[PDB]
Amino acid sequence: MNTVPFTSAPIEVTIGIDQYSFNVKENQPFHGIKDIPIGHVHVIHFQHADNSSMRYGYWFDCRMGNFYIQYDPKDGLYKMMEERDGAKFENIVHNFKERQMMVSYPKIDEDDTWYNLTEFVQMDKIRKIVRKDENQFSYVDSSMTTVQENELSDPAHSLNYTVINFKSREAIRPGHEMEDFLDKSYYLNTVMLQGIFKNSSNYFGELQFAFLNAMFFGNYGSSLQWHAMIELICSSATVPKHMLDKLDEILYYQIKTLPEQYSDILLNERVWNICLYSSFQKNSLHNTEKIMENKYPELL
Amino acid sequence: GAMNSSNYAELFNNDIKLFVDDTNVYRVTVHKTFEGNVATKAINGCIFTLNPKTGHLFLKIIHTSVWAGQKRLSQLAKWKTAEEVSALVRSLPKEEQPKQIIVTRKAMLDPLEVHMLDFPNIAIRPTELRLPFSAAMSIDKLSDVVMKATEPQMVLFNIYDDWLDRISSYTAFSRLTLLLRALKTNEESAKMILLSDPTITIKSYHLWPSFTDEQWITIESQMRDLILTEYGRKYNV
Ligand SMILES: CN(C)C(=O)Oc1cccc(N)c1
Ligand SMILES: CN(C)C(=O)Oc1cccc(N)c1
């Protein structure tokens, strides 16, 4: 179990750690988060009390270094940093734990939620979507745009998700226009899975990361990406059976975890009704269809 | 964007454009089987592709053999239309290819767009106008090259005959749309207006009679009466 210490909390802020969140008052004696489970990526995220504008945060993996948070009064945000001096870090953490100035990552033992939301998400793939190679952790916020969004403006600050576009030469084989547009199996299995992602685990990892950025930061381009990746599978007549069974599990836990009051903006009515009721896989997402129908019957 | 009453003069500017109508591509007669069930028999159809500025009509005849052994024919018809339009554009010299293609039914947008991915600078547009292009197929000579076809065939016509020697393309299009609206709403009583007088004939190389300018005004007036009436006979007014 690892620790992310905070230098201080000079501004009132709601702090999130994965799916948990807590309020910290201006200048409250808060010095970080302990007992963070090893073996998973994590996200620590922030919303200032004075400016709910800009949710922002950092994706990290404590196996890749010792990381802490420090408020920057010039740029006006909580920044993640790496501490290269190992004995300095251990000494900092042990003092803060001794003075009980840290919150405990509050995982319930029966609870697999975070594992189920991040099963295929790897830090190395996050760092290729979010390019800032001098750091081991990745910054994301509500306003960052995606590569595909830029085509339709600062490249350094973009989310480099895999571009999916159903009306594109990559998606449509010359001479198979109707076939490839109505059955996207070619595009899913050959172009994306065999060609670009290499395997379905990398595909699911990007889908999961896109959902998490949509949910935690209200990142609109990430929501677009999540839905596009769902639609590409559902619109394929030919999908490996293990992929469909895993997709159903993935989506089920995403829908389970979604705030009930954010479903109006985070869920695209057209994609979901198509996927669950019109698509080739309309009968292949039993768990997802049952939770959607019992929790968001309005959308449908 | 969508083509409507507001931007109607754009049809007659000097940017090449084509209307594409797919109504008459997949055509059937519905009949009873010996067992008393219902079946369809397809008949020949056509794609109606019209340059509104010149009157250049590319009439691609769709022979019933193209449906043999195929499923979901109404859906296939839209993709077949898009494939043929795409093939037509690729056959034209660059300086004759359209800058816009306007489809008369919105269901043609995605099929044409996918077939034209190679042509990103050709705009595919819908329209809000209720254009009466199915109604060409009621002109006997048109009913006949389509029905007589024994194989796929492209037939080239000017749908305005020689009108552009005397009127503008705006006026020619308006005449065409009035005749076709007329030939829709009531084929029989609108068939009388054009040839119930035996001294006005069509040249061998034309679709409409050689009306003089004054006879066209009379004819056009008779067609508007027909359309207004039928709109009464229909709605009782
Ligand atoms: C064989 N004929 C004379 C023929 O096509 O009759 C029509 C019918 C309707 C409109 C026109 N223009 C001509
Ligand atoms: C390229 N096409 C549309 C074409 O030339 O159409 C015409 C025009 C005028 C007379 C004839 N016979 C055909």
UniProtKB/Swiss-Prot annotation, chain A:
Residues annotated as carrying Phosphoserine in the record are: S236
**CDD domains given for it?**
Aar2_C, Aar2_N
- Pfam families in the record: AAR2, AAR2_1st
- Domain of life of the organism encoding this protein: Eukaryota
Per UniProt, the keywords (alphabetical) are: Cytoplasm, mRNA processing, mRNA splicing, Nucleus, Phosphoprotein
One GO term of the cellular component aspect?
U5 snRNP
Annotated spans, Leucine-zipper: 244-265
The record's Gene3D superfamilies line, in alphabetical order, gives:
2.60.34.20, Aar2, C-terminal domain-like
Major localization class? cytoplasm
Where in or outside the cell is it found? Answer: Cytoplasm; Nucleus
Where Phosphothreonine occurs, the residues are T257
Q: What is the effect of changing S236 to D/E?
A: Disrupts interaction with PRP8
What kind of modification does the protein receive after translation? Answer: Phosphorylated on serine and tyrosine residues.
Assembly: Heterodimer. Interacts with PRP8 (via RNase H homology domain and MPN domain), competing with BRR2 for the same binding site. Component of a U5 snRNP complex that contains at least the U5 snRNA, PRP8, SNU114, AAR2, SMB1, SMD1, SMD2, SMD3, SME1, SMX2 and SMX3, but is not a component of the U4/U6-U5 tri-snRNP complex.
Question: Any extra remark in the record?
Answer: Present with 7330 molecules/cell in log phase SD medium.
Full protein name? A1 cistron-splicing factor AAR2
Query: What organism is recorded for this protein?
Result: Saccharomyces cerevisiae (strain ATCC 204508 / S288c) (Baker's yeast)
The gene that this protein is the product of is AAR2
From Swiss-Prot, chain B:
Q: Where in the cell is it found?
A: Nucleus
Q: Which domain of life is it from?
A: Eukaryota
What cystine pairs are annotated?
Answer: none
Region feature (RNase H homology domain):
7-237
Consequence when changing R105K: Severely impaired growth. Reduced growth at 30 degrees Celsius. Strongly reduced growth at 16 degrees Celsius
The extra comment attached to this record reads: Present with 468 molecules/cell in log phase SD medium.
Quote the entry's note on domains. Answer: The MPN (JAB/Mov34) domain has structural similarity with deubiquitinating enzymes, but lacks the residues that would bind the catalytic metal ion.
Assembly mode? Component of the U4/U6-U5 tri-snRNP complex composed of the U4, U6 and U5 snRNAs and at least PRP3, PRP4, PRP6, PRP8, PRP18, PRP31, PRP38, SNU13, SNU23, SNU66, SNU114, SPP381, SMB1, SMD1, SMD2, SMD3, SMX2, SMX3, LSM2, LSM3, LSM4, LSM5, LSM6, LSM7, LSM8, BRR2 and DIB1.
Quote the function comment for this protein: Functions as a scaffold that mediates the ordered assembly of spliceosomal proteins and snRNAs. Required for association of BRR2 with the spliceosomal U5 snRNP, and the subsequent assembly of the U4/U6-U5 tri-snRNP complex. Functions as a scaffold that positions spliceosomal U2, U5 and U6 snRNAs at splice sites on pre-mRNA substrates, so that splicing can occur. Interacts with both the 5' and the 3' splice site, as well as the branch region. Has a role in branch site-3' splice site selection. Associates with the branch site-3' splice 3'-exon region. Also has a role in cell cycle.
Spell out the protein name for this chain: Pre-mRNA-splicing factor 8
Q: Which organism is it from?
A: Saccharomyces cerevisiae (strain ATCC 204508 / S288c) (Baker's yeast)
**Parent-protein start and end of this portion:** 1836 to 2069 of 2413
